[PDB]
Design a protein around this motif. Sequence first.
Motif, PDB file in Angstrom:
ATOM      1  N   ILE A 182      27.289   0.209  14.721  1.00 18.43           N
ATOM      2  CA  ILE A 182      25.890   0.087  14.357  1.00 18.43           C
ATOM      3  C   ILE A 182      25.286   1.476  14.465  1.00 18.43           C
ATOM      4  O   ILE A 182      25.207   2.043  15.559  1.00 18.43           O
ATOM      5  N   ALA A 228      22.044   3.007  14.118  1.00 18.17           N
ATOM      6  CA  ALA A 228      20.634   2.639  14.052  1.00 18.17           C
ATOM      7  C   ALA A 228      19.798   3.904  13.990  1.00 18.17           C
ATOM      8  O   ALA A 228      19.357   4.437  15.004  1.00 18.17           O
ATOM      9  N   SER A 229      19.589   4.398  12.784  1.00 13.87           N
ATOM     10  CA  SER A 229      18.717   5.531  12.549  1.00 13.87           C
ATOM     11  C   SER A 229      17.336   5.043  12.167  1.00 13.87           C
ATOM     12  O   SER A 229      17.126   3.878  11.839  1.00 13.87           O
ATOM     13  N   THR A 232      19.679   1.320   8.834  1.00 13.44           N
ATOM     14  CA  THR A 232      20.565   0.828   9.882  1.00 13.44           C
ATOM     15  C   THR A 232      21.853   0.342   9.241  1.00 13.44           C
ATOM     16  O   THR A 232      21.823  -0.523   8.366  1.00 13.44           O
ATOM     17  N   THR A 263      24.199  -2.633   4.878  1.00 13.92           N
ATOM     18  CA  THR A 263      23.102  -1.880   5.454  1.00 13.92           C
ATOM     19  C   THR A 263      21.811  -2.669   5.339  1.00 13.92           C
ATOM     20  O   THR A 263      21.716  -3.637   4.587  1.00 13.92           O
ATOM     21  N   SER A 297      14.525   0.147   7.903  1.00 11.35           N
ATOM     22  CA  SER A 297      14.931   0.265   9.294  1.00 11.35           C
ATOM     23  C   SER A 297      14.382  -0.843  10.177  1.00 11.35           C
ATOM     24  O   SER A 297      14.646  -0.834  11.381  1.00 11.35           O
ATOM     25  N   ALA A 346      17.765  -5.298   9.864  1.00 12.46           N
ATOM     26  CA  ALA A 346      18.987  -5.193  10.651  1.00 12.46           C
ATOM     27  C   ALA A 346      19.547  -6.570  10.961  1.00 12.46           C
ATOM     28  O   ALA A 346      20.766  -6.759  11.003  1.00 12.46           O
ATOM     29  N   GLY A 399      18.478  -1.322  15.947  1.00 11.02           N
ATOM     30  CA  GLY A 399      19.774  -1.429  16.590  1.00 11.02           C
ATOM     31  C   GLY A 399      19.916  -2.691  17.413  1.00 11.02           C
ATOM     32  O   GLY A 399      20.948  -3.361  17.367  1.00 11.02           O
TER      33      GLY A 399
END
Lengths: 63, 201, 127, 97, 226, 25
Positions: C9, C11-12, C16, C33, C45, C50, C88
């Motif tokens: 994962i 997680a930016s 994600t 994604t 994001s 996610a 995330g």
Amino acid sequence: TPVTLAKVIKVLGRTGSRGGVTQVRVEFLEDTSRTIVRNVKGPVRENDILVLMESEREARRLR
Amino acid sequence: SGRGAPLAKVVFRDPYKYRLREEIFIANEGVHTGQFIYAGKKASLNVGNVLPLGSVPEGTIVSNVEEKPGDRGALARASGNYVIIIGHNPDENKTRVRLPSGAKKVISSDARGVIGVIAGGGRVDKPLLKAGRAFHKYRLKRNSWPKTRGVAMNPVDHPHGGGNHQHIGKASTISRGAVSGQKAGLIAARRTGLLRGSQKT
Amino acid sequence: SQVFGVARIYASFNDTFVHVTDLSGKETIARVTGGMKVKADRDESSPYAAMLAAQDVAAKCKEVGITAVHVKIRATGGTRTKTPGPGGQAALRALARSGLRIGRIEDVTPVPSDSTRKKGGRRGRRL
Amino acid sequence: PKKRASNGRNKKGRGHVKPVRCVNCSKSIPKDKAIKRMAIRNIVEAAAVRDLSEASVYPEYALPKTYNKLHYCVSCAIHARIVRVRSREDRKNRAPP
Amino acid sequence: AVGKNKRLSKGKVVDPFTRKEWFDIKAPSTFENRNVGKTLVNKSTGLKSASDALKGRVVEVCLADLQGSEDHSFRKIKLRVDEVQGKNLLTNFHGMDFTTDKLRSMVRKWQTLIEANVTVKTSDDYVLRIFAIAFTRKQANQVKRHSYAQSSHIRAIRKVISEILTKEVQGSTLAQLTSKLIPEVINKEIENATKDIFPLQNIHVRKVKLLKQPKFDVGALMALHG
Amino acid sequence: MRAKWRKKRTRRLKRKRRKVRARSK
RNA sequence: GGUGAAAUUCUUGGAUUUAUUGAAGACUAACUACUGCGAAAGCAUUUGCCAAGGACGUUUUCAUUAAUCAAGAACGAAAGUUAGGGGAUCGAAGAUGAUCAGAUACCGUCGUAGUCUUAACCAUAAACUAUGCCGACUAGGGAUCGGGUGGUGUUUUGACCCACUCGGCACCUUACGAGAAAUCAAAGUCUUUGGGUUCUGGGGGGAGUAUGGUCGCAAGGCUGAAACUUAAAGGAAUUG
RNA sequence: UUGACAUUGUGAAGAGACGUUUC
RNA sequence: GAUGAUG
């Protein structure tokens, strides 16, 4: 799609820029002992029953 | 004469009949008269000795490296120049070396070289102040000086020649397929202009 | 008993990644994604995106045959943030609730020792 | 006038202190002047600890943690509400909250 | 975003999982549990072969999962596929490393951090780089609030570590080195030798990574799997 | 104006007086 | 991918993401602190080599050899200059997307000189503690760095612990005292005015400008006016 | 400069067409 | 952490 029901057990506070969105914690009727926190749009008390269209979305707080 | 680096004369002893045999080397820096020069598969790693490339460690600096075993030296013979040894490939009997030009080759481990750098370095950092010092430089090289510009000639003499002003008239970049008489200017040029930036190797 | 893969994962902010692989890392089982679950750039994001992305990985891993997955959580790192993004936790939650067993969890952000220069200039982002 | 005896930084008996970059705006600030906080948190948020226990293959698995040290410039420390303007008498206090 | 793509191609489908099989990774004999998992690969079609892709792929595995107790959970191992016999893959040690969380928890402030590293070759022609980490610990009944050490101390502690690591890695084979790593023997040697310099805590052989391997001999690998 | 930029202006002005006057040398 | 939201841009010719391996340059994280060293600028991975230095200990030695200095001299962050090497990141200029009444700006993406090193110049900074150097004297409390003395203190010479002392970086309380105040253990021992000594200032502007010297390849550095104009500019606190 | 034919032989693998074989 | 010139 299926729909699940839950029962308000506490009212935490109020949010939104203008206060029209109360924050609640709930207990699911079937499969109790799972609790989620989410936002509501009208007046609300303890022991109310809310119909949740999707169960697994825990709700953010503006503060 | 006509060569910037100094030579060295080393006399070995003929191993098959009673006489001395003299050999012209190219001097490496620090080689002085009376010195002993050992050449072979089992000579030591000192400046002046002639070792195979597979018998020296990585990072060594050698000169006069032969590009196939037995050619008697081809690759670093100008003043101040040398070769670096990057890696060994024992399975293939091949060595990786960086040349004075920035290129990288793969040449047999059995090929030889001399340890050090060529003497006479720093030569091209003193200006030739006079046209008379360029005269005597080429007087012992060949007939290539002075140079007349093609754009100052007539159209019978050069592709660039002719015109009421001195100008090329067409792109100075010439196709690699051009025939003799057409190749003047820049031949098969990948770019042109003032080189700004990194080497882009 | 259990067939194990590895779940990564990334997680930016701005997106994600949730994509599972074999235990050796070379072969991928599923990659999806957050962006391919939402229509607007700003919501890529988001925790919800996610969550949807992780529910597709679980669906596919079930039929390929993976019944458990370790976890490695990542941020941009290097000269960049080094702090996990908004989505995330949602992906990790969604894998757990989809029926996939969870093994070890580790944070695998690249930390730079001391590094090359950082973007933005000497006065930073003036905003 | 002179607002602080420390000049807003912890430098005494040194000429120079090497710089560090802020975690929001990337602006350079000497290490001794930056506002530094050590953030540690469980890898799984509080709401998810229960569901992860059920899924855990291993029994009795201890939750890992995340560690990072964060450097803020003065402008971004005020804005994020990490430090706040403080009264004159209250500026001298050094103790944490 | 779903509906933002401009061009699909620069110009103007089958299920891939029907053409794969699973294999069974096997650890060497140095570890109690010989089974570590399974992996996929494409079948041995004419222009390919399963072994040509299986060879040289690396799998990381917890040491607790190879010995039978989650106490050792903060150390990991790397194994490298060397030969494919039948439908299982045989592997040999490749290195070792701590978990990021375990290492970062050790690094607290108000103490001095000592590190050391050494490059040596075992008796069976492997080359390794072993890393070590120590810390300074408060003495019992200590009133002063930090436990720093003078640089004279750190230079000696770092020198004692260096000679214990060389001494213990050479003479022993790589397999014999693995058997010394699991019981945490070296961490006890360092403690005993560094007593008279400075008290220490959290002494660990942080990681070990291979740098060069001897020419592959099949006999070595089979010895550790039969 | 800001002290720094006023200083700059006087410098870019002297550089010009310094060359126009070089025409008479 | 990027933003507060976006666009330019890259992608079915396989981008982003994943694995294994390799090359290049820079940097020295976390440990890192009201801690250390140096004349200042400055100095942070390991080990070896070359020279140097403070404090401390001393019933060694010399015997006024000393303090502070116009002229003269060495070192002197960043940027900048000349010639080789290196040139990964970031990035004055430049080129582009967005925002806007405009945006030749802030924000997004590229990117030359530069950034790094060798040889040789430059000589500047809020180069700050906006506080010159040597010396003697005047109040209370504790913490820390280096050396030494006593406690055969206590756990296993070393590490700690208690007391004491010399030399440092600092810090907390107070007003005998100082000050226009902010504040200060020096900015005190100054109308009760004198321990030695060096440097600088004389209302705000014009002006760190013109001119002549002198130093530099150049950018520029040091030295540096006058005519004329002007009743206020300025410092610390107070109520709005 | 590129293709085809001749100089032009000999042993192995992978695939393919109505045993022989051409890439 | 969108925009907001002047009398």
